[PDB]
């Protein structure tokens, strides 16, 4: 790839390095990820949604694997950090949640899960958009904070519902300026979820006790009242958030259904100052 003049390293990680890069031909500026190694992906090139960072190209050359993405300058994590003094305005929080739910409705409608939503993976632009990025497509230190309980319990087959869970945790964090469930281990992550939402049993979650890593000796914590979870979210927002953090993947609200939730009756598209 002498076809790309590399502007700056956007990131590393076990699965590859990404650069902001200039196409010496196009003049176009892209993010370029080189996966170090040792067609299904290309179908996604034609699946484009305003709220998903676009996959432009997949290149298998000199026995290397490169993915090319649309480039955006800021992610939600940096934006929340610079907003920590003030917080993100609720109409902008509402707008970002609405847009993320649209992105997720789109990918889920095509049976594509994200599986690792986090503020670092959510890109925003000056025109008020927010886009899903980093779908871990390379799989045919990392935060557990947004991980759905079925994954933490070793479930081999998870559903679209894992993304709803992740986005709820992100919703809550946008509102409170605090990570909802800052576990420092898998079992610490689980037990932080339990201590707030109550230890799940078959009553609220049939088949929880059949998950691979479920132990009957999990401590039994009572559910806390949601009022402490996301103050000062109003009742519509708490209602919505409660349905996104449902223990049972089959009762957790879908992306499509959340879009019809009353919380969004007054949704607008504010513009951030970046
Ligand atoms: C923020 O820092 C990061 O980690 C950024 C680096 C960065 C990238 C672009 C930028 O503009 C800015 C920064 N991301 C990645 O490395 C990264 C990795 C992957 C992957 O799978 O390996 C991505 C997959 C898609 C799928 C798209 C797709 C999915 C489903 C459908 Cl239906 C249609 C399309 C979209 C963006 C992706 N990004």
Which H/E stretch holds residue 98?
Answer: helix 90-109
Between CA 97 and CA 43 the distance in angstroms is 27
CA torsion through residues 90, 96, 99, 101, sign: negative
32: phi then psi, degrees, rounded to nearest 5: -125, 120
CA 158 to each of CA 102, 111, 148, 209, 249: distance values in angstroms, whole numbers, following the listed order: 20, 12, 9, 16, 8
Resolution of the coordinates, Å: 2.2
For every residue of 161-172, DSSP letters joined together read: HHHHHHHHHHHH
- How far CA 236 is from CA of 90, 162, 166, 223, 242, in Å, comes to 13, 22, 19, 20, 10
The atom of ligand 1 lying closest to the CA of 121 is 1
Contacts of 136 (CB under 8 A, 6+ apart): 15, 114, 115, 116
Cis peptide before 217 (omega within 30 of 0): no
214: helix, strand or coil: coil
Ligand 1 pocket test, pick from 79, 109, 133 with the greatest ligand atom count within 8 Å of Cβ, gives 133
Distance CA 194, CA 188 (A): 10
For every residue of 12-69, DSSP letters joined together read --TT-EEEEEEETTT--EEEEEEE----HHHHGGG--BTTB--EEEEEEETTEEEEEE
DSSP secondary-structure letter at 222? P
Of the residues 38, 57, 81, 116, which is catalytic? 116
Domain annotation for the chain: domains and CATH numbers: 8-69 (3.30.200.20), 74-264 (1.10.510.10)
116 is catalytic: yes
């Amino acid at each position: 790839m002498e076809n790309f003049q590399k502007v700056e390293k956007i990131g590393e990680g076990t699965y590859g390095v990404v650069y902001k890069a200039r196409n010496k031909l196009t003049g176009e500026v892209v993010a370029l990820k080189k996966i170090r190694l040792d067609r299904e992906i290309s179908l996604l090139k034609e699946l484009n949604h305003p709220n998903i960072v676009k996959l432009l190209d997949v290149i298998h050359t000199e026995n290397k694997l490169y993915l090319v993405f649309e480039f955006l300058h800021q992610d939600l994590k940096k934006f929340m950090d610079a907003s920590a003094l003030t917080g993100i305005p609720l109409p902008l929080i509402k707008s970002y949640l609405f847009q993320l739910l649209q992105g997720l409705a789109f990918c889920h409608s095509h049976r594509v899960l994200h599986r690792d939503l986090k503020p670092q993976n959510l890109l925003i632009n000056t025109e008020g958009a927010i886009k899903l990025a980093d779908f871990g497509l390379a799989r045919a230190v990392v935060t557990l904070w947004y991980r759905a309980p079925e994954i933490l319990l070793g479930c081999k087959y998870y559903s679209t519902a894992v993304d709803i869970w992740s986005l709820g945790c992100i919703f809550a964090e946008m509102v409170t300026r605090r990570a909802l469930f800052p576990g420092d281990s898998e079992i610490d992550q689980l037990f932080r979820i339990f201590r707030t939402l109550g230890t799940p049993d078959e009553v609220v979650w049939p088949g929880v006790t059949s998950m691979p890593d479920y132990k009957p000796s999990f401590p039994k914590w009572a559910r806390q009242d949601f009022s402490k979870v996301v103050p000062p979210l109003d009742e519509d927002g708490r209602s919505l958030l409660s349905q996104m953090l449902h223990y049972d993947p089959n009762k957790r609200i879908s992306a499509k259904a959340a879009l019809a939730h009353p919380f969004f009756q007054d949704v607008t598209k504010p513009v951030p100052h970046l």
